[PDB]
Amino acid sequence: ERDISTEIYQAGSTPCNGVEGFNCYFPLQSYGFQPTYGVGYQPYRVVVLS
Amino acid sequence: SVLYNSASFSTFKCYGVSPTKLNDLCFTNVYADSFVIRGDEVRQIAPGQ
């Protein structure tokens, strides 16, 4: 099943509608992966042939 | 009832384990600490920091 629909999760007192910080989070974040890092951590090509 | 969703007591700056599912699991020994903040605000309380 696809998961295209995205929406900010709400479990505390904050709806986190652009107010990230002070016990508020946003799932999408920038990793900041510079090239010369642990190539063992590099993502691989994964394919499923049902 | 007043552990996590008190909504009127103070902040709950915590991380690592699920702040909701721990209510089910039972432990043997529970530790209590009476100390003072590290000094700036909370800043230097972070793994890898």
From Swiss-Prot, chain A:
Q: Where is this region: Disordered?
A: 1-26
Domain of life according to the entry: Viruses
* Annotated phenotype, changing E20K: In strain: Beta/B.1.351, Eta/B.1.525, Theta/P.3, Iota/B.1.526, B.1.1.318, Gamma/P.1, Zeta/P.2 and Mu/B.1.621; May enhance affinity to human ACE2 receptor
* Listed result of changing S13N: In strain: 20A.EU2, Iota/B.1.526, Omicron/BA.1, Omicron/BA.2, Omicron/BA.2.12.1, Omicron/BA.2.75, Omicron/BA.4, Omicron/BA.5, Omicron/BQ.1.1, Omicron/XBB.1.5, Omicron/EG.5.1
What result follows from mutating Q29R?
A: In strain: Omicron/BA.1, Omicron/BA.2, Omicron/BA.2.12.1
Q: Using the UniProt annotation, give all residue ranges assigned to the region (Receptor-binding motif).
A: 1-44
Q: What is the effect of changing Q34R?
A: In strain: Omicron/BA.1, Omicron/BA.2, Omicron/BA.2.12.1, Omicron/BA.2.75, Omicron/BA.4, Omicron/BA.5, Omicron/BQ.1.1, Omicron/XBB.1.5, Omicron/EG.5.1
Intrachain S-S bonds: C16-C24
Under the subunit heading, UniProt states:
Binds to host ACE2. RBD also interacts with the N-linked glycan on 'Asn-90' of ACE2. Cleavage of S generates a polybasic C-terminal sequence on S1 that binds to host Neuropilin-1 (NRP1) and Neuropilin-2 (NRP2) receptors. Interacts with host integrin alpha-5/beta-1 (ITGA5:ITGB1) and with ACE2 in complex with integrin alpha-5/beta-1 (ITGA5:ITGB1). May interact via cytoplasmic c-terminus with M protein. May interact (via N-terminus) with host bilirubin and biliverdin, thereby preventing antibody binding to the SARS-CoV-2 spike NTD via an allosteric mechanism.
Role description: Attaches the virion to the cell membrane by interacting with host receptor, initiating the infection. The major receptor is host ACE2. When S2/S2' has been cleaved, binding to the receptor triggers direct fusion at the cell membrane. When S2/S2' has not been cleaved, binding to the receptor results in internalization of the virus by endocytosis using host TFRC and GRM2 and leading to fusion of the virion membrane with the host endosomal membrane. Alternatively, may use NRP1/NRP2 and integrin as entry receptors.
Name under which the protein is recorded? Spike protein S1
Q: Which organism is it from?
A: Severe acute respiratory syndrome coronavirus 2
Q: Please indicate which part of the intact protein appears here, giving the first and last residue numbers and the full length.
A: 465 to 514 of 1273
